[PDB]
């Protein structure tokens, strides 16, 4: 019932020899605890890890508390620090109570920014740039929802937090031929630094829409109204250093008009595959939002959104509400689908573009494009999915921007998968340097580890042997630098009563500012479990975990 699990060992280049001596405590039903001494030899100490899993009427939750009283390596790298202790607190709760109450907690807090580069990555990763601390309580019924939440972030590499944020949604569907809804928000923005601006924002957004449909066509007209009020304080330091002055009280009022239309054509694929059907779906959307000068409002939670094919028909250029770009545009796209004789969709391909009649402006336009294009067909997007057979599949997408004068981003993947144990996958990701310069901070464009963009080729494979052995491998490689990014091997032997898996991983683990090269971490560890072949668990163990693409 409650006792000692099998101890497990590892060898990493970060802590040398690592030993784990877990102890399981079944406190009650819906209450488990796990106390793990974790001896690290390079740091010469024992980290105490405490996991607590609970189930209650409010939902399911898991807490984790890791505490290392002292650290020799951290002491050597920080000889002027008062204490070398490290710790991590994690709490994940999710629940819906009585179908109306929704409780969510996603809280991570570490003692220092270098925690995930030095310790196991169970609830965090070394690829993470920050830790999220979110609380949320919501009340949701069929035509109403009201949520109060808090969002804070611990950056590892000044951050704004919503303390608190309140969102309200109301819906009413049968007001004559019109559907109506109203959205409201009230947020308080606070910064970690004491010299940055603080804000209180209140936003109202009533929307009305007339939908119309046929068997072949559909058209939706929508009129939306946006009214935002900003009260800004602590503007002295910012206003003393910037030629553009922030305003203490701001009112931003703007309407939005949108028209969306879709058509569907069908035909029979007589020549290629009798019984197969091909559908052609043209879609158009006109969007108008008048220009409002928003340079006097600080940007707290608005970021530029990626524009894939589905994002072409989005009505917003930025997230949040601090920046709302003016729009006078028409988005046109076409999607072709191929269904088999059983009415199952085997193929789809979509291509679309956005045409701007006027420049999209927010009053603060600091993004660095490669050219001064303002109007015309500036954004193109394409996507494709092909289920070649029951075991073969290929996905792909591309995003091109003329203002970059380059392909913005692209991704592709081809996967064979006979079952959960037998699979191969090849994937490619690309992000151009121009996109990195445009959509990211300036030091990203000037830094060696950021400026070249992304050109990454990944290969994953998994094969069973003899119905008791499973071998899994992964290799992710960067073509720009011609250097390895990630590599993983794992072999597991599964029996009736027990399973033994041994895994190896080499990963990028940081950057060395002195000699200007990436740091690599190697880890080889064994694990024994008391008793599938564990292929899927091994495939999710590296910093670039496997995801099924059919």
């Amino acid at each position: 019932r409650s006792g000692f699990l099998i101890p497990n060992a590892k060898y990493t280049t970060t802590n040398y020899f690592e030993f784990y001596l877990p102890y399981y405590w079944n406190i009650a039903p819906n209450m488990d605890a796990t106390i793990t001494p974790h001896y690290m030899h390079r740091r010469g100490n024992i980290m105490w890890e405490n996991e607590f899993r609970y189930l209650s009427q409010a939902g399911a939750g898991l807490m984790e508390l890791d505490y290392l009283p002292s650290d020799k390596v951290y002491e050597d790298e920080h000889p002027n620090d008062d204490s070398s202790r490290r710790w991590l607190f994690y709490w994940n709760h999710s629940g819906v109570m009585d179908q109306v109450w929704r409780f969510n907690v996603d809280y991570t807090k570490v003692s220092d920014p270098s925690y995930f580069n030095d310790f196991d990555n169970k609830y965090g990763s070394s690829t993470d740039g920050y830790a999220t601390q979110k609380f949320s309580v919501g009340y949701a019924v069929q035509n109403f929802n009201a949520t109060v939440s808090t969002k804070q972030f611990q950056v590892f590499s000044s951050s704004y937090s919503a303390e608190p944020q309140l969102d309200v949604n109301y819906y009413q569907n049968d007001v004559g031929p019109f559907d109506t809804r109203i959205y409201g928000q009230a947020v308080h923005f606070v910064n970690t630094r004491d010299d940055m601006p603080e804000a209180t924002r209140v936003h109202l957004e009533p929307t009305i829409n007339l939908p119309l449909s046929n068997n072949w066509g559909s058209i939706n007209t929508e009129a939306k109204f946006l009214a935002t009020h900003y009260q800004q304080t602590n503007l002295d330091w910012y206003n003393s250093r910037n030629t553009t002055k922030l305003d203490e009280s701001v009112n931003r009022v703007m309407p939005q008009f949108k028209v969306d239309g879709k058509m569907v054509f069908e035909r029979d694929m007589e020549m290629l595959a009798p019984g197969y059907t091909q559908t052609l779906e043209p879609r158009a959307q006109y969007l108008y939002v008048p220009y409002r000068d928003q340079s006097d409002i600080y940007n707290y939670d608005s970021s530029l959104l990626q524009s894939d094919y589905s994002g072409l028909f989005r009505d917003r250029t930025y997230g949040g509400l601090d920046r709302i770009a003016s729009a006078n545009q028409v988005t046109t796209g076409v999607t072709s689908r191929i269904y088999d004789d059983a009415a199952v969709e085997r193929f789809n391909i979509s291509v679309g573009q956005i045409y701007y009649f006027t420049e999209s402006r927010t009053g603060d336009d600091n993004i660095t494009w490669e050219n001064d294009d303002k109007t015309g067909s500036l954004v193109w997007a394409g996507d494709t999915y092909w289920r070649i057979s029951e075991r073969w599949g290929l996905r792909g997408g591309i995003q091109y921007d003329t203002r970059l004068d380059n392909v913005a981003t692209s991704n592709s993947s081809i996967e064979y998968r006979r079952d959960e144990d037998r699979l191969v996958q090849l994937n490619y990701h690309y992000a151009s340097p121009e996109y990195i310069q445009a959509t990211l901070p300036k030091y990203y464009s000037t830094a060696e580890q950021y400026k070249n963009g992304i050109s990454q080729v990944g290969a994953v494979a998994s094969r069973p042997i003899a119905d008791r052995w499973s071998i899994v491998g992964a290799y992710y490689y960067d073509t720009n630098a011609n250097k390895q990014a990630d590599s993983m091997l794992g072999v597991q032997y599964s029996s009736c009563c027990y399973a033994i898996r041994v895994g190896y991983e080499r990963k990028l683990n940081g950057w060395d500012n002195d000699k200007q090269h990436a740091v690599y971490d190697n880890a080889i560890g064994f694990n024994i479990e008391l008793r599938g072949l564990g292929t899927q668990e091994m495939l999710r163990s590296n910093i670039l975990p496997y995801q099924n693409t059919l």
Binding site: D247, V253, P255, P290, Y291, D293, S326
Partner: peptide, 17 residues
């Protein structure tokens, strides 16, 4: 800041300088 003129409907849909 500023105050809307008499023609609120036309002024709501115009652009900003």
């Amino acid at each position: 800041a500023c105050k809307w003129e008499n023609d609120i409907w036309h002024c709501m849909w115009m652009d900003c300088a």
